[PDB]
Amino acid sequence: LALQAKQYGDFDRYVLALSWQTGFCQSQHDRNRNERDECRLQTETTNKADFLTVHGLWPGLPKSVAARGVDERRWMRFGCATRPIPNLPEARASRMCSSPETGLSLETAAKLSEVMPGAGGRSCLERYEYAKHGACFGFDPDAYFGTMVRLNQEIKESEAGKFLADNYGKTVSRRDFDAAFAKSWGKENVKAVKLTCQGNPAYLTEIQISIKADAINAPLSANSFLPQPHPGNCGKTFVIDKAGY
């Protein structure tokens, strides 16, 4: 089904936030945070591209919301719980299972789990994600999570995903990562990607991709992306973190 906002649809972009799952787990470990079940075993996998998981799909600041004194910072911090609007219940990162069950179908839930290891169970990442980024738009949860799943697949199967797999555990350059993204998606769209790194030597933790709001329901092409000014904190080279701490 098509992902469509019922209200507040006047935003420019979605950010598809993809974790480099091994690096995410590495960063939580490095910062002495309580280990998550998704991370515990440091389980290896045949297609290393499968470590690129879905963190979320984040609408940008709606113009209606911006008009009420809400800036980017507030929007990023609170999403659907921004005051004075949309002012839906706050999603708490420390208590993700306190957010409502999303009502996603069992079929969608199982597909989601494959690419979002923290979905469901007593982890509930998808509850938190929908509460912060979807509930106030009235997104259909199946359409919303199905879209995340599809987009993640598209990235994974692209030259960008193959680059991560082919360079698993290695130091890569932004130059070469960008060339890989460009191969699939166009040189003009390299700047639609923000890369986040942690640690020293720095390793990849997240890939954020800016997509035109009006393009979200189409398979990704050179026309789907919204380049942005912020490349992220990864610097010129960084490590594609391997499973294990």
Q: Interface residues with Ca ion (CB under 5 A)?
A: 22, 26, 241
- Torsion sign across C-alpha atoms 207, 213, 217, 222: negative
Residue nearest to Ca ion (CB): 26
Q: Name the residue nearer to Ca ion (CB basis): 44 or 107.
A: 44
Q: Which of 38, 126, 129, 206 is catalytic?
A: 129
Strands (E), the chain: 13-20, 52-59, 171-173, 193-198, 203-212, 237-239
The least CB distance from residue 26 to Ca ion, in Å, is 4
**CB count in 10 Å sphere of residue 122:** 7
Active site residue 55: yes
Q: Which of 55, 126, 154, 206 is catalytic?
A: 55
Active site residue 29: no
The least CB distance from residue 203 to Ca ion, in Å, is 7
Q: Name the residue nearer to Ca ion (CB basis): 235 or 244.
A: 244
106 Cβ contact list (under 8 Å, min separation 6)? none
Q: How far apart are the first and last CA of the chain?
A: 40
The least CB distance from residue 38 to Ca ion, in Å, is 14
Q: Name the residue nearer to Ca ion (CB basis): 26 or 189.
A: 26
The least CB distance from residue 2 to Ca ion, in Å, is 38
Residue 165 to residue 46: CA distance in whole angstroms: 10
Q: Name the residue nearer to Ca ion (CB basis): 29 or 150.
A: 29
Please, what is the angle between helix 141-157 and helix 106-115, to 10°? 30
Active site residue 230: no
Strand partners, 204: 197
Q: Which of 38, 114, 126, 133 is catalytic?
A: 133
Please, what is the angle between helix 125-133 and helix 141-157, to 10°? 110
The least CB distance from residue 29 to Ca ion, in Å, is 8
Q: Name the residue nearer to Ca ion (CB basis): 136 or 207.
A: 207
Residue 199 to residue 172: CA distance in whole angstroms: 15
The catalytic residue positions are: 55, 129, 133
